[PDB]
From Swiss-Prot:
Its main location: endoplasmic reticulum. This is Tyrosine-protein phosphatase non-receptor type 1. It catalyses: O-phospho-L-tyrosyl-[protein] + H2O = L-tyrosyl-[protein] + phosphate. Signal peptide: none annotated. It comes from Homo sapiens (Human). The modification Cysteine sulfenic acid (-SOH) is found at residue 215. The chain holds residues 1 to 283 of 435 of the full protein. The gene is PTPN1. The lineage of its organism: Eukaryota, Metazoa, Chordata, Craniata, Vertebrata. It is found in: Endoplasmic reticulum membrane. Residues 3-277 form the Tyrosine-protein phosphatase domain. GO terms for molecular function: cadherin binding; enzyme binding; ephrin receptor binding; insulin receptor binding; non-membrane spanning protein tyrosine phosphatase activity; protein kinase binding; protein phosphatase 2A binding; protein tyrosine phosphatase activity. There is a cross-link at residues 215-216 (N,N-(cysteine-1,S-diyl)serine (Cys-Ser)).
Length: 283
């Protein structure tokens, strides 16, 4: 079926939970043996969220190459994304090592450091220009260059220096700051505006390594971001845009990381975002 009318048909019939459970039943199951080794317990935020072995990002290190991060490679859309958990106190150096080694331009953050009164990720970037951060375990230096605070999101320019080689690179930090503590946003308008700002920066483009996107677990809000981006790109590429099947795209993405889209409300919100976004792309 088309999307917008499949949408109203699920609303009127109140069957979002049944649609979402079908997706959960059909989703791929692949091994995640490296994530479960005892030496990696303090590298995982949640025991039930792990990268598959076949798609995990490897650190260029011989001691321990493990990080909770997955490469999502979308062949027809010609887009790739790295989805990862919010960094932990003992993985902030690994996080920036990955950004460096994978040649990423942009980092997309969809959570606040504290939500619901608890810490959802480490304070992994500097908050003042004159107070830079040094990660001694991976030999990197990170400096805040500039910060632009808007009503729904903040964009930061950061300088990452590899202290071994003295090479430097400019990284863009895109921080969506207004996702509610409970539920999903009422309108997708600010989320879509944010997506377009990431796109306009070059961070999603083939001349750079894959964008790094995270929330707390790296599957819920993060899944919504890449699902909406890929579906809108396919609608532009194909002769028949009504042939884009959001459930099929999501199942394809779940071949590369488990659990993408965590609730039936997140599924409904993803439909809403693609529907509204397809009108703005053209009128």
């Amino acid at each position: 079926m088309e999307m917008e009318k499949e949408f109203e048909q699920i609303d009127k019939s109140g069957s979002w939970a049944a649609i979402y459970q079908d997706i959960r039943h059909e989703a791929s199951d692949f091994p995640s043996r490296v994530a479960k080794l005892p030496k990696n317990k303090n590298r995982n935020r949640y025991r039930d969220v792990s990268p598959f072995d076949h798609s995990r990002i490897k650190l260029h290190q011989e001691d321990n190459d493990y990080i909770n991060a997955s490469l999502i490679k979308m062949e027809e859309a010609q887009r790739s994304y790295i989805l990862t958990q919010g960094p932990l106190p003992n993985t902030v150096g690994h996080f920036w090592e990955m950004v460096w080694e994978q040649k990423s331009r942009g980092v997309v953050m969809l959570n606040r450091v504290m939500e619901k009164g608890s810490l959802k990720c480490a304070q992994y970037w500097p908050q003042k220009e004159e107070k830079e951060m040094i990660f001694e375990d991976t030999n990197l230096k990170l400096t805040l260059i500039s910060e632009d605070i808007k009503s729904y999101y903040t964009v930061r320019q950061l300088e990452l220096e590899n202290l071994t080689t003295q090479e430097t690179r400019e990284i863009l930090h895109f921080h969506y700051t207004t996702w509610p503590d409970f539920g999903v946003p009422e309108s997708p308008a600010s989320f879509l505006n944010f997506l377009f700002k990431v796109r306009e920066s070059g961070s999603l483009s083939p001349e750079h390594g894959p964008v790094v996107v995270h929330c707390s677990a790296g599957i819920g809000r993060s899944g919504t971001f890449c699902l909406a981006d890929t579906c809108l790109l396919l609608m532009d590429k194909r002769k028949d845009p009504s042939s884009v099947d959001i459930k099929k795209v999501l199942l394809e993405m779940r071949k590369f990381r488990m659990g993408l889209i965590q609730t039936a409300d997140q599924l409904r919100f993803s439909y809403l975002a693609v529907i509204e976004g397809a009108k703005f792309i053209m009128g």
